[PDB]
Design a protein around this ligand. Structure first.
Ligand SMILES: O[C@@H]1[C@@H](O)[C@H](O[C@@H]2CO[C@@H](O[C@@H]3CO[C@@H](O[C@@H]4CO[C@@H](O)[C@H](O)[C@H]4O)[C@H](O)[C@H]3O)[C@H](O)[C@H]2O)OC[C@H]1O
Ligand SMILES: O[C@@H]1[C@@H](O)[C@H](O[C@@H]2CO[C@@H](O)[C@H](O)[C@H]2O)OC[C@H]1O
Ligand code: NA
Length: 183
């Protein structure tokens, strides 16, 4: 419409991935469970601080999984997740804590860590990860991206030179199912 021009499809063939760029809808099924890591979703080839409104039916109980706003910064290279709902794994349990940000009716746990020679948008490289994890989880609403971006910025996040930006469903162990719409 508004406004999808990018499809995220990292190892989506681990499960069952269907999408519609025009409708702004995608679904992902991994009920048989997943052996490896996948990240799928819809969005834009260049991200911004514009708010994202999403609606999703998300079932990832007993699954290391995220329903999240997902994207990259080109340089310095950074990967980010604004996690709205998740399964059994919270990234801020092991990662370096950055504190708390408040956005859109809930506090988010903010944490960071550094991946060395891991799969990236530039093949395989060293990059910083930024996580925002919602305290009281939801599967629909508006993500004020600007709020998270500005908070991360105070901790080294580039806050410019963005690559793609998507509403994504990710999982790397266990079983689940998801269906999403981007307003
Ligand atoms: O329209 C909706 C239908 O799509 C949904 O129908 C079925 C729901 O279950 C879906 O199945 C998937 C199938 O893929 C598994 O994945 C494969 C897993 O093993 C891998 O080796 C392989 O590469 C993958 O392709 C996944 O675990 C499992 O969840 C099935 O596709 C659907 O069509 O029914 C309701 C309708 O509203
Ligand atoms: O766009 C793709 C990225 O999604 C992928 O990044 C990995 C996705 O899974 C995450 O758990 C990892 O932290 C991350 O390295 O890299 C390949 C790229 O094409
Ligand atoms: Na939107």
């Amino acid at each position: 419409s508004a406004g999808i021009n990018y499809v995220q499809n990292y190892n989506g063939n681990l499960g069952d991935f269907t999408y519609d760029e025009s409708a702004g809808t995608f679904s992902m099924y991994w009920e048989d469970g997943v052996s490896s890591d996948f990240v799928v979703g819809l969005g834009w080839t260049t991200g911004s601080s514009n708010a994202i409104t999403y609606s999703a039916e998300y079932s990832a109980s007993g699954s290391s999984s995220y329903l999240a706003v997902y994207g990259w910064v080109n340089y310095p290279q950074a990967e980010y997740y604004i996690v709205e709902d998740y399964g059994d794994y919270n990234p801020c349990s092991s990662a370096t804590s950055l504190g708390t940000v408040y956005s859109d009716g809930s506090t988010y746990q903010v944490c960071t860590d550094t991946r060395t020679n891991e799969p990236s948008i530039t093949g395989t490289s060293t990059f910083t990860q930024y996580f925002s994890v919602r305290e009281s989880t939801r599967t629909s609403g508006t993500v004020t991206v600007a709020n998270h971006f500005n908070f991360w910025a105070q901790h080294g996040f580039g806050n410019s030179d963005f690559n793609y930006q998507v509403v994504a469903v990710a999982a790397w162990s266990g079983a689940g199912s998801a269906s999403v719409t981007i307003s």
